[PDB]
C-alpha cells in the first residue's frame, strides 16, 4: 500500500528498563537482521543490576514481528506499519502464578528499528525455575494472530525445557498496534517461533540471542 | 508390530450432556493414519437437534491419524494392538467449561472409539448457545510429558459470524494401555478440522481432519 | 412456605474421575433456616476410590445456607418446583471437574441427581494420591452473570505437610419455574468436613454450615 | 515501645503505566491499624486527567490495617518498624493485566509507601477504558504460605453501570524486611474499599477502606 523503507538487511537498537521480583535492571541490545527471512541477532549486555538474580530466559521474547517471513496470502501488518513504527503489549502467565508485563515502543530511522522495552515481573516462588535460574530454552512455538476488540492480538502456549527434562508452561498474549491510520488488519493466522541464546557468560551479564519466525496459515497448505 | 493398517474404518459412539441437554452421536468413517487424514459421517441418535454450536463437539470425535516423521517417536501407533485412552479439558474464554474422554480400541481394520462429553457454565448469549460458530481454525497442538504422562497443549480458536474469535484452551492428557510404551520428546502436532458438510439441524455431520507431527522451526 | 424448619435429603451420585467410574448414594438431614446439613454417604460402586474423597465433598445445596432478611434468598424461593446447578472445578496442577445436581423436593425430602467427572489429574498429585487432609473454610461471591445467578469461590484444601492446594469454583445456579427474582450481589460464608469415614472412605459422613452476608461493614 | 501506634499517618507515592498511559499519584492519610480502618486523599501529580477506571487502582493504595484478633497471627504489625514489601498480580476476565508492588517503611508515626502499577491488554471497548465501573464489591482474601511466603487470593468483583459485574482474580505476595517474623496459619481478610468523594476527572480522590481478619465459619 506504500513504501515501508524496511530494507533486507536491518540493524537493531534496544533498552530495556525493568523490575522482576522486586530487582532492578538496565539491559541493552545490538543487533542486526533479515526482515524478509524473519530472521535476527543480537548482542545484550545487563548495564545496571547484573548479575541477574532470575533466568534470563524469561526476557528473551521481549527482545519485533517485523523479524518475522510473511507469504503474500497473508497480510503483514507489522511491516506495513513502517516507516511510522509501531508498539505491543504483552503479559506472560507462568503455571506456578509468576506474571510478568511487556511493553516495546519501535520506531525506524534509516537502516535501524529502535525499541523501548520495559518488563515487569511478580510473584515468582523462591524455590521456582526461575529464582533459582533452572531454565535450558524456550522450545519452538507457535503464535495465533487473531484481530481481538479491533486490534491484532497474539497468544501462545509456550514451554520452557528446563534441567532434568521437565516443562515449564507459559501463556503469552500479546497486543500490537500501528503507530499509524490505515494499517489493515489480517485475518487468522499463525506465527511459528524459534527463539535461541547462541552464547553468553556465566552470569548471563553478556548474552547473544537468535529468533527466527515464519508466518503460515496452518494445514492444510503450509 | 503395531497392526495399523494404511486404510483403516473408525466406529464411535459418543454419549454427553451439554448444559444439562443429553445426546447420543453415532459416527462411522475412514482414515489412513499415515496420512494424518480421516473422514466420518455423524448422526445425533438422541437429543436432536442439539440446542448448542456442533462446533464444541468435534475434536472429541485420535491421534493415531497424524503423520509421523521418522525422528519423533509416535506414541500413539505404538500404542497399538493393545490400544490407549485420553482425558480432555476444554476452557473456553467466558467461563464453559468442557471435559472429555476417548478409549480407543482396534479389531482388525476398525478402530472403536467410546467417547464421553460433557460441557457446563456455557452463557445464554454466548456463541456457543447462541450457534455463533462457523469453524475451528487451523491449530498446533503442543506436546510434552508431565508426571510421566504424554500431554498435549493447544491454543484455539473458533472462528464467529462477522469474523470474530472465541478462544479455548484444551488440555489432552494420553495414555497407552501397555505398560512400558515409549514417551517422545517435546514436539508440536499441526491440526485442521473441517465440517465438509450437515443438515440444517446438525442432526447428520460429514467430519475430516488432516494432522501432522513435526519439530518446528527451523527443521519443520 | 414449602421448606420446612427440619429437612431431609436423598442423593445419588454417579461420576467418573481418571476413568474410574464410581456411584455414591447419600442419606441425611438439615435445618435449612440454619444453613446447617449432615449426611451419610456410601460407594455403592467402584470401591475403593483411587483419588481423594475431598474433591467430592462440595458436590454432595444452597437451601442450606442461613440467608438474612435483607438479601434474597434465591435458593428457598426454588421451591417446591426446585432447582439445578452446573459448577467446574479447576485445580492449580490442572485437575478439572465439571457437576451437576438436579434438586427436587417431595414433602420433607430434598433428592438430588448428581453427576460428576474429573480429568487430568496427575498421578502423583494430593488428589490420586489421596494427600488431602480437609477444605479450609471459604467464602463464595454470588452475582448475576448473563440473567444467571453465579458463585465464584478461590478454595483451598490442605494436605499432609501443611501445604495447601487451590482449586477455583465457578457454581451456575438455574431456579426450574420461570420468574424466580435473581438476588442482588452477596457472599455465602462455607465450611464442610468429613466427620468420620472408613479407612477406604467406602463410608463417610459429611457436614456443612453456610451462612450468606453482604460483607464488610454490614456482616 | 510497640512500633504500631493507635493513630497513624500515610504517606504514599505511586507511579504507573496503564496500556501505555504514564502517571504520577501522591497519597496523604491517617489510619487506626488496630480497627483495620484507613482513609487516604489522592492526588494525580502527571498523567491527569487518567484515562482509565480510578478503581483498578485503589487496592494499590497495606495490611497493617486490618483488625486482627487474638488467635491469628498478625504478621504484618510484626513485620514493623523494619516494614515489608508486596508484589500483586491483578487478571481481569477480559484479558486486562496488572501488576503492582509496595515497599513500606515506617518513621515515627508514618508509613511511607512506594508503590508501582503496570497495566496492559485493557480493550479499548472495555469497562476500564470506558471508565463505566462503580465500586469495588466487599471481598474475602484468602491467606496462605506457599513457597516460605505469605500469600492472598482474592476472587474480586468491580459493580459497573446498569449492575453488571466485571470480575478481577488478585494474588498478592507478602514479605517481611526483617528474618524471622513468624508465618500465620491459615486465614480469610474481609475487605471493603470504597471511594469517599472525587472531582470530576478524578485527579482528586478520597479513599476509605475496612478490613477485618477471622477464621470463617463456624468460628465467625
Ligand atoms: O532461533 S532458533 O534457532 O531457535
Ligand atoms: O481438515 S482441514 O481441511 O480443515
Ligand atoms: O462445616 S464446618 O464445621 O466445617
Ligand atoms: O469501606 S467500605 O465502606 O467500602
Redesign the pocket.
Known amino acids: 500500500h506504500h513504501m515501508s523503507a524496511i530494507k533486507p538487511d536491518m540493524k537493531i537498537n534496544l533498552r530495556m528498563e525493568g523490575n522482576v521480583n522486586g530487582h532492578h535492571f538496565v539491559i541493552d541490545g545490538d543487533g542486526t537482521g533479515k526482515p524478509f527471512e524473519g ?1 535476527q541477532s543480537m548482542d545484550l549486555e545487563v548495564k545496571e543490576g547484573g548479575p541477574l538474580p532470575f533466568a534470563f530466559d524469561i526476557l528473551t521474547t521481549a527482545f519485533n514481528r517485523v523479524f518475522a517471513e510473511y507469504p503474500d496470502h497473508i497480510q503483514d501488518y507489522f511491516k506495513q506499519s513502517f516507516p511510522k513504527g509501531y508498539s505491543w503489549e504483552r503479559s506472560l502467565t507462568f503455571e506456578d502464578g509468576g506474571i510478568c508485563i511487556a511493553r516495546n515502543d519501535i520506531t525506524m530511522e534509516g537502516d535501524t528499528f529502535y525499541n523501548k522495552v520495559r518488563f515487569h515481573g511478580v510473584n515468582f516462588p523462591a524455590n521456582g525455575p526461575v529464582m533459582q535460574k533452572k531454565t535450558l ?2 522450545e ?1 512455538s507457535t503464535e495465533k494472530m487473531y484481530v481481538r476488540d479491533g486490534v491484532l492480538t497474539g497468544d501462545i502456549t509456550m514451554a520452557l525445557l528446563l534441567e532434568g527434562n521437565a516443562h515449564y508452561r507459559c501463556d503469552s498474549r500479546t497486543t500490537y498496534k500501528a503507530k499509524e491510520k490505515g494499517v489493515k488488519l489480517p485475518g487468522y493466522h499463525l506465527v511459528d ?4 541464546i ?1 552464547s553468553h557468560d556465566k552470569d548471563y551479564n553478556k548474552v547473544k540471542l ?4 515464519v508466518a503460515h496459515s496452518g494445514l492444510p497448505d503450509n
Do not use: R, T
Open positions: 530472521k530454552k524456550w519452538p517461533h524459534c527463539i535461541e547462541l537468535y529468533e527466527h519466525a
